[PDB]
Amino acid sequence: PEPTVLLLSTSDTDLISARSSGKNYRWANPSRLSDLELTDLLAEASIVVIRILGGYRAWQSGIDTVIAGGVPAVLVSGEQAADAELTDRSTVAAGTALQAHIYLAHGGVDNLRELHAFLCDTVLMTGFGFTPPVATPTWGVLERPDAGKTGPTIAVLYYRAQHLAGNTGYVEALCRAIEDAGGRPLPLYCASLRTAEPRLLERLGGADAMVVTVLAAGGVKPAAASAGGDDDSWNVEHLAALDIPILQGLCLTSPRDQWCANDDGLSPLDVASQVAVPEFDGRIITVPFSFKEIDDDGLISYVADPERCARVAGLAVRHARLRQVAPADKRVALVFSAYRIGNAVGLDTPASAVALLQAMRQRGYRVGDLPGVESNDGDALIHALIECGGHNPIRVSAKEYRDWFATLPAELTDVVTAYWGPPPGELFVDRSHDPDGEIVIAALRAGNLVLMVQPPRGFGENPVAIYHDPDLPPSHHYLAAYRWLDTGFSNGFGAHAVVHLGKHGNLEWLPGKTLGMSASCGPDAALGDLPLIYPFLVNDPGEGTQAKRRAHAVLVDHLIPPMARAETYGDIARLEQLLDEHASVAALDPGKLPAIRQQIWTLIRAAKMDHDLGLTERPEEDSFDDMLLHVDGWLCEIKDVQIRDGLHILGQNPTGEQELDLVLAILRARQLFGGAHAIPGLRQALGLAEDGTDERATVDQTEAKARELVAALQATGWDPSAADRLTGNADAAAVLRFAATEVIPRLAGTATEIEQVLRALDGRFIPAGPSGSPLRGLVNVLPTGRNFYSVDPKAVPSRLAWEAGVALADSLLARYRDEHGRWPRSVGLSVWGTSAMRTAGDDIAEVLALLGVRPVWDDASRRVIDLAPMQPAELGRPRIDVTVRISGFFRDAFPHVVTMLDDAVRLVADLDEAAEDNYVRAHAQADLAHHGDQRRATTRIFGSKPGTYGAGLLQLIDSRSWRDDADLAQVYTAWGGFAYGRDLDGREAIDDMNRQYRRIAVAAKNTDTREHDIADSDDYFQYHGGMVATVRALTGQAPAAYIGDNTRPDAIRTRTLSEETTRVFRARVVNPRWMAAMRRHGYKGAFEMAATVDYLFGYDATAGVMADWMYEQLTQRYVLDAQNRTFMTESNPWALHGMAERLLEAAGRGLWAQPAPETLDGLRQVLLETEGD
Ligand code: NA
């Protein structure tokens, strides 16, 4: 290459290929070229080649300049067919331009090298010699020497465009890491895995696992394939047929220095394209091993991180190794969540563990002789774990621990030692045998299995960290325990895989980057290359997704608990009888109405239902019957609501009456199926509106009719043809046919849940599926047993979610104005990622609706692409200010939405509107007048500290190290006083948070799923109650606290927090049907009762939701009742102790204001006997 050839191409692949060729090329992209730069380059050229799309007119100025300069010019098209005008305008022979066109059309490093010689010899009559153009295959192998490794074959799939450019260094580095891990790398390039060639799929049959760096293969419109959509259209059957693990190795389109600098690991583009959508394929999400770097010429190269290459290679080899290890030789760690061992939402963790261990033994695993496995006794198993696994014991030498600890990045070891001291720390360190230290790890070992309680996060060991350190790193004991599960320590367990039981553990919530884990990230240091298999509740998409992305988890999702109607009992049932009698007297003997009214009022007062009904006094006689219409609706709703009627056991599909009740609950909703609303609710098809206006009596009659039809269909073996014969109602018959055709066969997949855990332990491909609630008209989340995906994060809110958010906004405003006669100045709303995934964005739409901003959709992709403010005349009301508390996971998974909501606030803050029309602008102008900072004045979105998660108040309540509202607010603010949005990015903004929280008139939280309630999860009182308490601390007055009920999108309702608490209390908490159901589930059933006491306490401590009569009933039903006390004592005495302690704490703090002395004495006696038992 002596003569200089100038290559001007709008395809940077051409320019990189020319650089890779080693020939004497100059290169530039005409779209990034000034006139001076062109003439400067032309002065150095002996031959010029121009390749552009659009023909001569697309760069006429540049082409005319080259031709006028006299240098021989070769003009070719970027289109496949050559451009005859470019051929003729070239100042070489036509055949020279035509052959050059072919060299560049085929492309690749070889063709660019021969092109240089072809042009020199042809135009300048040099004598280099040249090869004709060579075709480049649509797919092929990156040829490398065989290192002779004997491990599994790991395919590496990368883009053909990178192969042609010669930018394969990032692939070579991953191949070398695979060889270092003992595997055999099979690097393959291709244009797409969606349209994969047959011979390419054949070649992949020789792989034991695949690391892919290409986009998802199932389709091109993921927004149409999520829950309720056309998931069949997302097709990866050609890749699933290989039945091997497929791991996404992340190749960031951002530079490595930015990745190292921030906790915001991936750009919003990379979150969507390399994580969220690839999850639709069932791919395992790993870490970034290469990063996009740009040089001076604007040419892109991907540069690999060798350490991250080792993590990707190690993960791939470990997953492939699973297929090679027979069950008899396979070592498995079974890890239980803690903080109360076995936390798993909706799941009977002990019974599921027994059933899993029994199935593993049957498959040939060596499960030893664990208590309760042979005897089929979940209580025996979990009691054995508590006795020998709570935090013979495993001992890790301080020397070996330090040797591993020292291999971590200083960024991580500095923080760990700053909080926990130099290794091996002071937590569970024994100096008896070795004076230098041994870290003691409690675990239950049997055969090739270890059962371990997940190590504690560490906030119990340091309550000061609750007030100041949401970013508390894992302790040395935490790290030692997980590192002992792996290989490395001389006495290491050497697990082939980890199985974590149920939603959810704390490893995937440790401090670190949002996703794209680094070597300094807590989850990465703890888990390493260990495969993680994770049974997970199907209607908790956000929490499952966090495990997928921060701990490369393979989920095996599981069914919701059995559900049934709450029904009536006790004085609620007696009130039902009196209401019916009142209706008869009204129609037949209106003069007797005062007598039956007195009976009803006596009952309401005696049973404390005036608290449920918000009645401060007796209505006037001529307003009493109108009040009973409100009682009618209240009684109907607490009787009709679905509540759990047991707990799910892994692999156990409901049968008999439990199948009937669950199918009835599923069929009650209007079905979103195949993206359409074709099948109505069963009771809708039978006459009910289900919009919140149906009369109490007709709801019961229609429910009885619906139950009769489904019970008859069940009696036929769910025969689809029996539908038309069971009812002359065409709509009802279509619903029954839908139940037999879709609901029942998909429900049947629940029996494969344990089989899919075994398949995952064997390194087989686990099929993916949608996530969400099958009680919200989303039947395609069934079958379970799948590694679920969630949503297109750029397509929220959907149009259906927009409708719901508007209804939520309208319903909240109507309730507030009805009570106060004026609009609320500001609404505070807590927004979770799991909620956006369950609903496709109801919360987000509500914020936009309150601000008066409409989303703008691209109808093709269904993605949100813009915003459009509604004018005040159309809004008909002022723009309501909104303060948003996002969770840490919402920040992680929906970065486009965080920016979207911030854009909307700034949009409406800037509109020149009157204060009476725009509360956002009014508040922003007041703040702007205070400190003059425009960005601060429009700050509305707050969340967890960057790199961290949680709201802190669960830790505070469990530590009990608090006294007043100032303490509650300080912890809440320490964990959530951080601003998000453009140029905010999680910076501390305590003063801005206080300014906005002082304005909150309504603190709102939405309940979007029926499988659990606000007394079933700590997150509601933490976020919702935490907001209430923080506003009260700042202002001295609690804001209004509302619950938005979007469990039924076609019947959105708003109620106060007090109303929702009493509804949950009567319909579930002290409902004898629910208590009896939990007493069928031993330890975990008792656990759920104790958790309910804690979460009611948490909501009372923060928002005052409890009345003394509710504490009295809670104490009697849960603790003092002989039947429940006996059950608690046998199955879970630890939970009984915690319940009595918590109720005594409520009395000590005055939250329970006037407890009877005899009742407190009974509680103290329970404490004493339980310690003695
Ligand atoms: Na010519």
Side-chain angles (χ1 to χ4, degrees), residues 1-56 58-198 200-236 238-338 341-360 362-432 434-444 446-461 463-656 658-1173:
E2 193 276 301
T4 299
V5 174
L6 176 60
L7 175 61
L8 304 168
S9 181
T10 51
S11 168
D12 288 331
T13 302
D14 293 349
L15 311 184
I16 299 174
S17 294
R19 183 180 70 187
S20 295
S21 76
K23 287 295 209 171
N24 184 21
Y25 276 109
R26 306 292 179 273
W27 50 81
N29 192 317
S31 69
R32 311 185 300 254
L33 199 64
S34 67
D35 293 1
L36 174 60
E37 287 171 337
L38 172 61
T39 49
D40 281 356
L41 286 167
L42 287 171
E44 300 184 359
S46 303
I47 307 175
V48 189
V49 178
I50 300 174
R51 184 163 184 258
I52 62 178
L53 292 174
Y56 165 70
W59 199 40
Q60 179 175 0
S61 66
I63 292 175
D64 288 341
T65 295
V66 173
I67 290 174
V71 182
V74 191
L75 312 176
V76 301
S77 174
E79 293 82 335
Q80 297 188 14
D83 188 310
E85 182 183 8
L86 292 183
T87 295
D88 292 334
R89 284 182 182 273
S90 305
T91 52
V92 296
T96 306
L98 292 162
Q99 190 79 333
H101 174 91
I102 298 175
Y103 275 115
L104 292 162
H106 288 309
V109 179
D110 292 335
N111 281 325
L112 263 294
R113 176 174 33 249
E114 300 302 310
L115 173 66
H116 190 291
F118 167 77
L119 291 174
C120 288
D121 289 7
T122 299
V123 177
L124 307 171
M125 305 192 70
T126 56
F128 293 96
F130 55 85
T131 298
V134 293
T136 36
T138 60
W139 73 273
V141 192
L142 180 64
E143 295 298 336
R144 304 174 68 257
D146 193 334
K149 303 297 177 176
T150 55
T153 296
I154 307 302
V156 181
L157 272 290
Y158 65 105
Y159 272 129
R160 180 177 183 269
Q162 303 299 322
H163 187 79
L164 294 180
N167 273 342
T168 55
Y170 71 112
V171 175
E172 173 68 25
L174 185 52
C175 288
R176 292 183 183 181
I178 291 167
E179 284 157 343
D180 292 347
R184 300 180 58 80
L186 176 57
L188 299 169
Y189 64 88
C190 69
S192 171
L193 278 183
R194 172 163 60 88
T195 58
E197 295 79 3
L200 172 60
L201 295 172
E202 296 184 24
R203 195 68 159 89
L204 288 172
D208 300 302
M210 295 172 59
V211 180
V212 299
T213 66
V214 301
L215 269 32
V220 298
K221 194 182 303 194
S226 52
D230 183 1
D231 62 285
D232 283 344
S233 67
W234 197 269
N235 192 313
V236 295
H238 62 294
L239 296 172
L242 303 172
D243 197 24
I244 59 178
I246 302 179
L247 303 87
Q248 191 84 34
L250 306 178
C251 300
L252 304 195
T253 62
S254 46
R256 187 183 184 274
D257 70 330
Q258 294 180 12
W259 175 74
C260 289
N262 312 131
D263 291 295
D264 190 9
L266 268 61
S267 70
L269 157 69
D270 287 358
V271 170
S273 59
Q274 292 189 57
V275 178
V277 177
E279 286 174 346
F280 282 58
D281 284 13
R283 294 176 183 178
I284 304 173
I285 306 301
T286 74
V287 303
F289 74 97
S290 72
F291 303 85
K292 170 168 172 291
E293 308 294 338
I294 304 185
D295 64 2
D296 301 56
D297 328 304
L299 299 193
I300 301 165
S301 177
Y302 282 90
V303 182
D305 182 318
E307 188 277 331
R308 291 289 85 186
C309 283
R311 173 72 69 246
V312 176
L315 286 167
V317 169
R318 298 270 194 110
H319 281 83
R321 175 88 178 116
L322 293 173
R323 191 78 57 85
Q324 302 175 355
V325 182
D329 306 314
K330 189 159 292 172
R331 295 180 302 267
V332 182
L334 192 62
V335 180
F336 295 73
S337 305
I341 273 70
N343 203 334
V345 170
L347 186 70
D348 188 335
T349 335
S352 298
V354 166
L356 173 63
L357 295 173
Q358 290 173 346
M360 288 174 68
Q362 222 241 300
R363 190 51 56 83
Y365 288 83
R366 296 204 156 100
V367 304
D369 186 41
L370 293 161
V373 174
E374 176 60 45
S375 61
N376 196 37
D377 183 359
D379 282 4
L381 179 64
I382 200 69
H383 292 182
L385 178 56
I386 294 166
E387 167 180 34
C388 311
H391 307 289
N392 146 250
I394 291 92
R395 316 176 76 91
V396 176
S397 96
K399 175 58 162 49
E400 299 189 37
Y401 174 78
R402 186 182 73 214
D403 286 342
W404 164 80
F405 189 71
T407 71
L408 298 174
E411 285 72 13
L412 173 58
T413 58
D414 284 354
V415 174
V416 169
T417 57
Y419 283 86
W420 301 103
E426 298 167 325
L427 268 195
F428 298 113
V429 169
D430 186 18
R431 254 106 185 187
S432 302
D434 195 314
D436 291 324
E438 284 178 320
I439 301 176
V440 184
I441 300 161
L444 176 47
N448 283 337
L449 266 44
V450 57
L451 276 65
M452 181 182 289
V453 180
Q454 197 171 45
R457 177 78 175 79
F459 288 105
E461 190 58 43
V464 180
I466 302 175
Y467 282 83
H468 298 277
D469 307 292
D471 48 353
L472 178 68
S475 70
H476 295 292
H477 177 259
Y478 190 106
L479 297 170
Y482 269 99
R483 289 295 85 218
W484 171 81
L485 297 179
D486 207 339
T487 53
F489 295 151
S490 58
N491 60 334
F493 178 72
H496 291 105
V498 177
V499 179
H500 195 103
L501 281 184
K503 176 258 186 189
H504 57 246
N506 59 25
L507 185 141
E508 65 272 30
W509 299 94
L510 293 178
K513 301 188 190 307
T514 56
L515 73 172
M517 314 313 293
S518 73
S520 67
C521 293
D524 183 270
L527 190 55
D529 295 335
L530 285 168
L532 175 60
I533 302 160
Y534 214 146
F536 219 98
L537 180 59
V538 60
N539 69 284
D540 286 356
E543 302 87 341
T545 297
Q546 193 70 308
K548 293 170 71 75
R549 301 181 178 180
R550 303 187 84 242
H552 56 263
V554 175
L555 306 185
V556 181
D557 63 9
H558 68 74
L559 193 60
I560 64 167
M563 306 294 294
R565 222 158 73 109
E567 294 302 327
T568 59
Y569 61 92
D571 282 334
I572 292 173
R574 196 194 317 276
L575 175 61
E576 192 170 30
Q577 306 167 5
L578 292 183
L579 293 183
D580 295 343
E581 183 174 355
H582 178 274
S584 301
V585 175
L588 302 176
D589 201 340
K592 182 144 266 301
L593 279 180
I596 185 61
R597 290 186 186 118
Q598 289 182 3
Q599 289 185 59
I600 291 174
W601 188 245
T602 289
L603 175 55
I604 286 175
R605 288 281 285 169
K608 310 303 292 177
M609 295 169 181
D610 52 331
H611 182 237
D612 307 60
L613 299 166
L615 296 175
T616 59
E617 68 180 37
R618 189 190 194 274
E620 276 184 279
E621 199 69 9
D622 68 332
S623 290
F624 197 95
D625 294 354
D626 186 25
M627 180 271 299
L628 294 183
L629 299 185
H630 167 60
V631 179
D632 260 329
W634 165 74
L635 166 60
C636 179
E637 288 187 341
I638 65 170
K639 169 178 186 177
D640 195 51
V641 67
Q642 293 288 150
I643 63 174
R644 65 182 175 282
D645 195 42
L647 300 174
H648 182 62
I649 298 178
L650 219 53
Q652 176 178 114
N653 51 310
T655 58
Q658 298 80 34
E659 179 183 53
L660 166 58
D661 280 313
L662 184 53
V663 169
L664 266 175
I666 291 169
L667 294 179
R668 191 189 289 182
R670 108 270 171 255
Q671 302 298 338
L672 181 64
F673 192 84
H677 280 323
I679 302 107
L682 218 209
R683 306 193 308 194
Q684 276 179 341
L686 290 181
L688 281 187
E690 306 275 30
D691 62 353
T693 70
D694 287 307
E695 190 165 332
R696 169 180 69 84
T698 48
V699 172
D700 288 330
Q701 304 167 15
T702 309
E703 174 72 17
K705 293 177 175 57
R707 187 175 191 87
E708 196 177 41
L709 285 172
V710 182
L713 182 62
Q714 181 182 51
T716 74
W718 305 100
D719 195 332
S721 65
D724 276 319
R725 104 172 65 117
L726 285 180
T727 175
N729 192 318
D731 287 322
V735 175
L736 298 179
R737 204 153 38 243
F738 176 76
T741 301
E742 296 292 343
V743 181
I744 294 298
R746 293 170 180 272
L747 269 179
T750 294
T752 75
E753 285 166 358
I754 289 181
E755 186 51 58
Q756 287 291 345
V757 172
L758 296 180
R759 292 191 66 246
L761 285 165
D762 240 75
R764 306 204 172 263
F765 179 77
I766 305 302
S771 54
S773 167
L775 305 178
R776 207 180 190 257
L778 307 171
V779 165
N780 75 339
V781 306
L782 312 177
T784 54
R786 299 185 289 181
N787 181 17
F788 61 59
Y789 56 87
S790 54
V791 299
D792 178 2
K794 296 165 67 64
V796 295
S798 70
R799 293 183 177 272
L800 287 183
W802 171 245
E803 300 189 25
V806 170
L808 284 162
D810 287 349
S811 182
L812 178 153
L813 297 176
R815 183 65 187 259
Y816 190 90
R817 190 162 170 87
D818 281 354
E819 182 152 358
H820 305 102
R822 51 145 56 195
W823 305 106
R825 61 189 170 278
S826 178
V827 173
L829 182 69
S830 295
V831 174
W832 296 338
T834 194
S835 302
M837 295 175 168
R838 292 183 184 127
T839 68
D842 285 8
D843 290 348
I844 305 155
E846 185 182 7
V847 176
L848 294 176
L850 290 166
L851 299 176
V853 177
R854 198 189 317 272
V856 178
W857 293 270
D858 175 83
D859 277 4
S861 66
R862 307 184 188 182
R863 295 183 152 178
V864 179
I865 61 178
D866 215 337
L867 301 167
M870 318 175 208
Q871 295 306 313
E874 177 189 8
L875 202 55
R877 58 142 172 98
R879 304 191 193 278
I880 309 296
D881 208 355
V882 181
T883 293
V884 178
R885 171 55 182 279
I886 61 176
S887 64
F889 177 74
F890 188 95
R891 163 203 70 203
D892 292 3
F894 296 99
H896 315 80
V897 178
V898 172
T899 306
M900 176 198 304
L901 294 180
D902 186 49
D903 287 348
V905 172
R906 286 180 283 104
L907 214 187
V908 298
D910 217 59
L911 298 174
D912 201 342
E913 295 167 347
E916 280 206 348
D917 297 329
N918 189 335
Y919 300 163
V920 180
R921 175 178 184 82
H923 298 157
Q925 297 312 99
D927 290 353
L928 184 66
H930 180 79
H931 51 57
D933 191 311
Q934 179 69 27
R935 169 73 280 193
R936 292 189 52 192
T938 60
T939 295
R940 293 296 187 276
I941 309 172
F942 302 87
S944 289
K945 182 174 183 180
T948 80
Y949 304 91
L953 288 181
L954 178 59
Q955 287 79 4
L956 186 65
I957 267 59
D958 283 350
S959 79
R960 309 192 291 183
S961 296
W962 66 276
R963 153 168 51 197
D964 56 15
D965 288 352
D967 293 328
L968 300 177
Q970 179 177 0
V971 170
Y972 181 94
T973 307
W975 289 59
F978 303 88
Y980 287 89
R982 295 193 196 267
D983 300 322
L984 297 176
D985 301 317
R987 73 181 189 190
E988 172 269 301
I990 292 178
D991 286 325
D992 289 328
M993 200 205 72
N994 293 334
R995 296 184 75 84
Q996 311 313 324
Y997 272 54
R998 281 188 233 264
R999 296 192 177 104
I1000 294 175
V1002 201
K1005 180 65 184 78
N1006 295 326
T1007 59
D1008 41 26
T1009 221
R1010 271 285 165 247
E1011 291 84 348
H1012 68 261
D1013 55 55
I1014 63 166
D1016 271 335
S1017 174
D1018 53 284
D1019 289 314
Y1020 290 96
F1021 88 82
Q1022 285 200 81
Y1023 283 84
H1024 193 208
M1027 177 174 286
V1028 173
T1030 300
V1031 175
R1032 186 178 61 248
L1034 288 166
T1035 71
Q1037 173 60 41
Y1042 290 178
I1043 290 293
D1045 187 351
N1046 58 329
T1047 56
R1048 298 152 58 178
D1050 47 1
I1052 283 177
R1053 295 147 292 161
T1054 300
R1055 61 188 69 98
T1056 69
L1057 178 56
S1058 174
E1059 286 170 344
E1060 177 72 1
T1061 301
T1062 60
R1063 278 167 173 255
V1064 168
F1065 192 83
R1066 294 201 192 263
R1068 202 267 295 169
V1069 174
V1070 295
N1071 189 330
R1073 288 181 47 81
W1074 179 81
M1075 295 191 64
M1078 300 298 99
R1079 287 196 295 269
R1080 298 194 298 268
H1081 289 277
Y1083 174 94
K1084 188 53 164 49
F1087 179 101
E1088 296 293 334
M1089 293 179 182
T1092 297
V1093 175
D1094 281 347
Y1095 304 154
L1096 287 177
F1097 176 89
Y1099 245 134
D1100 196 31
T1102 52
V1105 307
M1106 289 285 283
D1108 278 8
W1109 74 264
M1110 303 164 67
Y1111 276 113
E1112 293 178 348
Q1113 294 304 311
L1114 192 60
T1115 299
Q1116 179 58 39
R1117 298 303 289 162
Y1118 279 28
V1119 181
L1120 299 182
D1121 178 71
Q1123 182 179 6
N1124 210 66
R1125 168 116 87 107
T1126 294
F1127 162 74
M1128 296 291 308
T1129 299
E1130 297 171 345
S1131 287
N1132 198 337
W1134 311 272
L1136 177 62
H1137 189 275
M1139 285 191 314
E1141 214 177 56
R1142 190 72 77 187
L1143 295 160
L1144 285 163
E1145 177 184 1
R1149 298 185 179 271
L1151 297 166
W1152 186 1
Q1154 292 182 304
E1158 179 188 344
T1159 305
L1160 296 188
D1161 291 337
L1163 284 170
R1164 300 184 189 105
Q1165 172 72 8
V1166 173
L1167 278 193
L1168 199 62
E1169 295 183 15
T1170 300
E1171 297 171 358
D1173 281 325

